Design a protein around this ligand. Structure first.
Ligand code: FE
Length: 202
DNA sequence: AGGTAAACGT
DNA sequence: AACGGTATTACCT
């Protein structure tokens, strides 16, 4: 019944911290606005994204990249809010990763219908560090697979405040998000947000 | 030699 | 609509 080797779900872990997290998402986005990024192959992603911390994930003509600069504003990504950093540290510790030091937080916003096709997180050079993923707002179905794309999927509803952590043996597992169902949430109104914490540099 | 990118039909 | 083809290649370093 645990998610996977090295992976855990902490249901409602961030529920108490959620209102402050959402205030800080709005602050981050007031500086580096949400944008829907374009893949190298030229398709616009359905998820809108921004980043905070020292490195932000971005698409480019040439591929994917972690960059210290927001290519839309040409300014550094906003500093990682202390509320984000503290929640991440607490969740990582609860999940068995007490030494995790993230330097990058990708903020995803899902409107109805928005999805993330099954992929691997592998843009980070240090594979030893876990990924911490915080869900806020509307619920979504998270796919969590194996090392091969065709490995059987677990499908888990992620609700407001749920935190998922993966690392170690499951660090490179395929995962994704199924198209978001429309709904109402009193804190986010009509969307889902996700915070994904990584150590993207040295 | 390796790593990268991937988001339509059944 | 869950599953899997496609990158079975074309480019970089
Ligand atoms: Fe991911």
């Amino acid at each position: 019944e645990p998610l996977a080797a090295g992976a855990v779900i902490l249901r409602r872990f961030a529920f108490n911290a959620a209102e402050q997290l959402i205030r800080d998402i709005n602050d981050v986005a007031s500086q580096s606005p949400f944008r829907q990024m374009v893949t190298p192959g030229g398709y616009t992603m359905s998820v809108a994204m921004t980043n905070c911390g020292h490195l932000g994930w971005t698409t480019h003509r040439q591929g994917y990249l972690y960059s210290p600069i927001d290519p839309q504003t040409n300014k550094p990504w906003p500093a990682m809010p202390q509320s984000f950093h503290n929640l991440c540290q607490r969740a990582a510790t609860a999940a068995g990763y007490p030494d995790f030091q993230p330097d990058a937080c990708l903020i995803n916003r899902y409107a109805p219908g928005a999805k993330l096709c099954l992929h691997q997180d592998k843009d980070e050079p240090d594979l030893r560090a876990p990924i911490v993923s915080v869900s806020l707002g509307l619920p979504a179905i998270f796919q969590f697979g194996g090392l091969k794309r065709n490995d059987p999927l677990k499908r888990l509803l992620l609700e407001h405040g749920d935190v998922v952590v993966w690392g170690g043996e499951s660090r490179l597992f395929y995962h994704g998000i199924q198209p978001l169902k429309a709904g109402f949430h009193p804190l986010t109104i009509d969307c889902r947000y996700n915070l994904t914490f990584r150590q993207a540099g040295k």
